[model samples]
Target: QYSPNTQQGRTSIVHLFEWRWVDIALECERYLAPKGFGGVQVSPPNENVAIYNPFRPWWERYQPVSYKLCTRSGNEDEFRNMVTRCNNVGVRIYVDAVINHMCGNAVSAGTSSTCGSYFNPGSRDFPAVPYSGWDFNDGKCKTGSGDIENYNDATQVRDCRLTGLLDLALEKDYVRSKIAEYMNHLIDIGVAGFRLDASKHMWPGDIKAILDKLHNLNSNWFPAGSKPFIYQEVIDLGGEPIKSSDYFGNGRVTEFKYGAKLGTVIRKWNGEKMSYLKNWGEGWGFVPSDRALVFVDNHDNQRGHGAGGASILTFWDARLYKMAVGFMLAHPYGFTRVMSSYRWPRQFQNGNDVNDWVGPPNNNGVIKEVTINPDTTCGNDWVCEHRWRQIRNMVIFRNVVDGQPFTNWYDNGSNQVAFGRGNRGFIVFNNDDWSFSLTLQTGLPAGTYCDVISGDKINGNCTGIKIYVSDDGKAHFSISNSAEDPFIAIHAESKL
Candidate 1:
């Protein structure tokens, strides 16, 4: 019932992918709050297996060993400090909760237990929480190996292990309580919500039951009785046993289709694939905006873990990706999440290039400390894309034009498209390899407005680029596609 409990007007969550707790705390104080970010979708805070024969991999956190908050990010105390500090600046933290299953044989052996305790894959034994043979779904699964082979069968999809990971029997009250306890633990620690990783593998009824049993928010920052925000990761592109809509009642479902489609559309924006997104919502086969959580590329998808073809855009190319993200933030989409990632070792970046399975930027076994430079850009292998001038400024633009919708839509024969948020804001994106100058309707009153794409309206005078609107709310707009920046945005708040 309570929508993304973002602080009053702010609305956005940046997935600070693999950032340490101390770094995250520092970021909240130094960057996020000032930049107008609402919340941070932090990496899995749970204790996981230590996979380092050669090196620690990022996916290690996904295969959780225990619900303990101690992690490569930080210990429980440090996590608490991070949450407290972030909340102090009105930046909420949403944890990546891995409740689908436990560690695999390799992870269990590498970590010397499920997560750091006694877990024997040979016997289906995990003594930490005392989960044994009966606690697993092997008996209920329809397949022989109890590993999912058929994506079409709901029984197989829900009961079978995904890629040989141990599947949990969430139907059991004991199992449900353990998972709820972990979530409640975060809630008690000031976590505002969760990214339910691998949620499609679990039964919806069981997840709902666990959610029902959980206590309300801690009442420190959240209103009393507010259910923690939940946006589940259900990879439903098409014709699968699992669809995102199945799990919407519990919370919002991750809309995977949005990214792939948007990327494909934009890639062809200048060519034969060009068309105006006149009806941008459910008409695109995406889940309803209210029941969806949208992103350009997530940690998994960017690294080729889930469904996405060559059409999907990522941080590899700055201009195209930024244009795509800027468009998403500018338009009223689902709960938007911008990814803050790290550099994968050279090989795993593209097709199988070459490198050990990479984790966060680490030295030997110890993960490196993330650093924010004076310009707010990060070093030590961190890609703080969300902090980019265009991205951050557009977030502010979105908040300024909060409830407004596209009013005046204009499109040239090429892929250049322009739209206005009623009289609140206006933006134009040029994707063709050409420049255009035209008098376009800005939808705002006649004034000198700072193009947020280039820079903010610092002091009384605009710092970066300025666009003047005429008495009739028309502006002589000029955008060069060949330039570094392909878009120009003017908002109500940017008026000087």
Candidate 2:
């Protein structure tokens, strides 16, 4: 369940938030497959409430109306075609499964779903799924408001509604079966696995029961008897009653702390320094690398709606964001998932963005199609971070250094740091106020390697800065704090 089931040499997943199925399929063949990206974490592929008050906010996808494979992204056919196409190129698809709830209980009963499915949130009735009041946690919740009021209370956190979303009675055999049925349908359609949404709200035992009911990965693309990969969204950052460890039995759990801490350190908040990251991963109180799904920021947190605190980095902080992502991809830590987000008109009042609930680029109520620019960037307000030269190069850097040990660690006791992945790759960061000019041990073979961050190696020539490693594997490194990126990365694949 923990395995990503990617083609060998592919190393990371990119969350194409709110991307259309057709767009994703084109991306797999045109970019991701060739870029060495392992897979894609697509937005929920289920029927959801078509909210109008917020004008089709992204969160509405989490408020599922039914298990029907229809949403703003595309329909069942488009989804099936996307999965098959992406898998054909060795790029797996992982659906963001929202099985923890239905639409908000306060929503009016009508055809408000993306598929126009009739549902009564107040009555806990969804005709599309044929679920009734019996499938909800109304009778199980002990909270007075039936909404999560205290994070300290484990039972209420699991059973109560999350911000008025109708909590599912996952403990019920019938509910588990229905949820499993939806997931099995996806698995049968060639999906590699799921990112179980709101998994922390569902009990581990109930989640296990549903997982057990799922079929193996589609045999056409996966090995026989291979279990579908499972990664649950559990925002465990300590102090919470529900620890991430509780859900490890089912699959890998999202490590929210990884981003929060990385953000704080990169931003130099709270006196935190990049040098302190010498002992990252489990040493920093994170879950085991094998059991952790790490990222710089996600859809929710990037909008300041989820955990990771305020220091969480996003495309808004492009300079620092690239450095943070570079450090993550270079270091051999947890399984990495990159964020590919869109641009919204960020309207802030006082401190918070009053327009955080804004949906993707839309005309009236329909999502705008992702248009590609001649420069390989995405137009129509799509901030295709995955296509950025620095990020995409780092993605490949990770693949080249896969399974390599974290060695050749060097630090200046502050924001400057450098390290190598065995002899395969090396990265240097200059977050200090002064310029960094020193001869460092890179641990790579003697050769001229292209600095992928600045540019690429093309036709046996480097399009950017090149580092020459001597016989002793020592190279002269130089970077100023005033530089645009403040980082340089080289790998065996970039060697001439």
Candidate 3:
């Protein structure tokens, strides 16, 4: 369930939040193909509720209208084109499946949704696939606010509406079939997998039943009998009645606490650090390597929403964020994912619309065309942090050291640290307040290795810092607290 379907050696999945279909296809061919990125997790493709009162916010996608596969990202045909184009370039597409609920308001049965689908939030009517009142949960559900009031109550969490959104009764066979049919269509369209939105809000048995009915992956890109990749959103910090492991049978669960823990350490660790790195993996209370889908930050967390814990790093905080990402991709842990986002207008700050529901750059309600610059970065209101050299190159570093064990650990008892991935890669970091210089054991062969962080290794020329490994696999390295960059990294693939 955790395999990312990365092309050959590619190992990172980038979440291209709110990107249009054509832009994804273009990105697959131009940037992702050259950089060795595994794939992308797109925003929910199904048609969604149009909240015009406060205008359309990004969370509207979470309140689905129908399984029509249409929305601001693109229509069904556009989606098909994107999947085909992306898959052809070895860049897979993973849909963000929003099957847990529908819009919050009650539209009568048989009424067409604002996005053009039939659904009545009232009377439990979603007739597009023809769901009736019997297809939903009723008064038997034990929750207050007509929604979930108690996190310790599994029944309330699963059966009740989330923030007033109508929850689905996936326990019913008809509901399972409807959800499966929506998913099967995507698998048939050559999609490799899905990110199960609100999987925690639904029962694991229901999810398993729906997945059990899914068709094998489309043969166009995958080998025969390949099960679709599924990673679920279950923010289990061991505080509530539900835990992430409860749904592990269906797919990997998001480790929300992992990044939060990393964030806490990043901010304060410099004063007393890296011995913390000695027992970092499962000791950090994360899920097992196979069942964990990890990231430094995701769409929700970066903005401090669902699972976006306190003080997480983001594109806005480049130096510390990049360092965190460097450590994540360099260290062997869970299946990793990267984030690709557009800049949200600062005016959304006061929160009259959806909470932090800053919509993408748009003309009224229409999302604009994404623009890429000549330098391979993006423009026209996109953050495009994935294009940053530190991030893009680490994508390659992760691929280069796939399955390699981390060795040659070193730390100066402060913020400075160094580690090597067997002989496949070597990296160093200096988060302290002063210059960090040392002769460290790199655990690689004697040679000059190309550094991937500061710059690229050109044709017989390295624009970045170069590491000279002496006969004993030791390199004399230093990053000034006054240095242009906070770190340096080298890997087998970038060796000159």
Give the number of the best model, judged by lDDT: 2
The superposed Cα distance between candidate 1 and the true structure at residue 475, in angstroms, equals: 0.5
With a 3 Å backbone cut-off (N, CA, C), the pairs that clash in candidate 1 are 65-115, 347-354
After superposition, candidate 1 runs with Cα above 4 Å error:
106-116, 269-274, 348-356
Which ranges in model 2 have alpha carbons more than 4 Å from their true place?
none
Judge candidate 1 at residue 16 and give its lDDT: 88
Per-residue lDDT of model 2, residues 231-309, tens digit only: 9999988997889999999999999999999999999998999999999989999999999999999999999889987
Quickly count the clashes in candidate 3: 5
Q: Per-residue lDDT for 1-496 in model 3, tens only?
A: 5677667788989998999998899889988887899899999999887776557777878887789988888888989999999899999899999998887845344543445776778767766767777877766477656787887889888898888878788888888998999999999999999999988889899899999999988887888878889999998877788888888888788888778777877777344365577668898888898988899888887776856466588887888889889999999989889888877754444543234677788898888887888887888788888999999999899998998898998887777888989998999988788998889988888888878899898978798788898999888998997766689999887778
Better of 1 and 3 by lDDT: 3
Candidate 1, position 247, lDDT: 90
- TM-score of model number 1: 0.96
lDDT, candidate 3, residue 129? Answer: 68
Q: How much lDDT does candidate 3 score? A: 0.83
- Which RMSD does model 2 reach against the true structure? 0.7
Alpha-carbon runs more than 4 Å astray in model 3? 106-114, 269-272, 347-355
TM-score of each: 0.96, 0.99, 0.96
